[PDB]
């Protein structure tokens, strides 16, 4: 009537992704962790844009929407930030937001690429990830783009720009020993990269007592967070959600 004793084995760790394996766990917990990776890890992304002057071929909403998807290095600064609506400031402050300013005037006879390099933050710890660089817009001669922006804490459930992951590969039972999926012709199906079957075999023998365990993860970071940090913040956030629900339930019972 109690918790499992889950175990971790990291099979690969780079700056782009972490690949690991969780054993001795329910499928629901593993899927919830996989889901929290996408929807509930808070990062910093541009969410307030004031355009002082735009002469580009792209209208203002296009530029703002593109700026929102710029990923920002939010490794440690995100934890000490607060959500803006929770912050008591007069709408903005260094404790709930990070200011950006962009001012690019193409006064030359060559197409000026306005990239992420031109985004200038008021905080050195929160820069564009590429700072090759993400192209915001291209400008002709005599075209100015001048705006300020603010980037705030949020998570991917609200909007996909706060999604830190760039694809979360998730798997379990690579040889289909549980027959949670039924191949009409198992011969035709290529082996998973985690399969332990020899090539003369196409499918592990059926396991009547099996249960899903040994879930294989490959979490790729878009760049806002290191993948280690993505997984750790995900587990911390899910634990925080469960503890808050525990507090509310204790209040409701009392």
């Amino acid at each position: 009537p109690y918790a499992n004793q889950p175990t971790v084995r990291i099979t690969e760790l780079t700056d782009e992704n972490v690949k690991f394996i969780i054993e001795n766990t329910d499928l629901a917990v593993a899927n919830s962790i996989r889901r929290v990776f996408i929807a509930e890890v808070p990062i910093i992304a541009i969410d307030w844009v004031q355009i002082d002057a735009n002469s580009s071929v792209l209208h203002d909403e296009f530029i703002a929407h593109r700026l929102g998807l710029i990923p920002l290095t939010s490794d440690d600064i995100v934890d000490k930030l607060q959500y803006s609506r929770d912050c008591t400031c007069e709408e903005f402050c260094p404790e709930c937001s990070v200011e950006f300013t962009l001012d690019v005037r193409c006064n030359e006879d060559q197409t000026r690429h306005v990239t992420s390099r031109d985004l200038i933050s008021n905080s050195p710890r929160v820069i564009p990830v590429t700072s090759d660089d993400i192209l915001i817009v291209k400008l002709r001669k005599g075209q100015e783009l001048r705006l300020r922006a603010y980037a705030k804490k949020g998570f991917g459930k609200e909007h996909a720009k706060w999604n830190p992951t760039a694809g979360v590969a998730f798997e379990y039972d690579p040889d289909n020993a549980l027959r949670h999926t039924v191949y009409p012709k198992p011969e035709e199906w290529p082996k998973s990269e985690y399969s332990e079957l020899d090539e003369d075999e196409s499918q592990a023998p059926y396991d009547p007592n099996g249960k899903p365990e040994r879930f294989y993860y490959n979490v790729e970071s878009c760049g806002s967070l290191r993948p280690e940090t993505i997984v750790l913040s995900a587990l911390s956030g899910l634990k925080k959600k469960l503890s808050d629900l525990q507090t509310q339930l204790s209040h409701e019972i009392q």
């Binding site: 844009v49 004031q50 720009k161």
Partner: protein, 44 residues
């Protein structure tokens, strides 16, 4: 009000009484200048 000529980009002032025409090209298409009221977008 300031209008921008549609052929030679010259910002020129025009009253609400005179016919519109570029004062250094003679062109007959003018565009209003962008508003100076603050415009704010969420980046969503």
């Amino acid at each position: 009000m300031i209008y921008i000529c549609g052929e030679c980009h010259t910002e020129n002032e025009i009253k609400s009484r005179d016919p519109i025409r570029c004062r250094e090209c003679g062109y007959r298409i003018m565009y209003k200048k962008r508003t100076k009221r603050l415009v704010v977008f969420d980046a969503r």
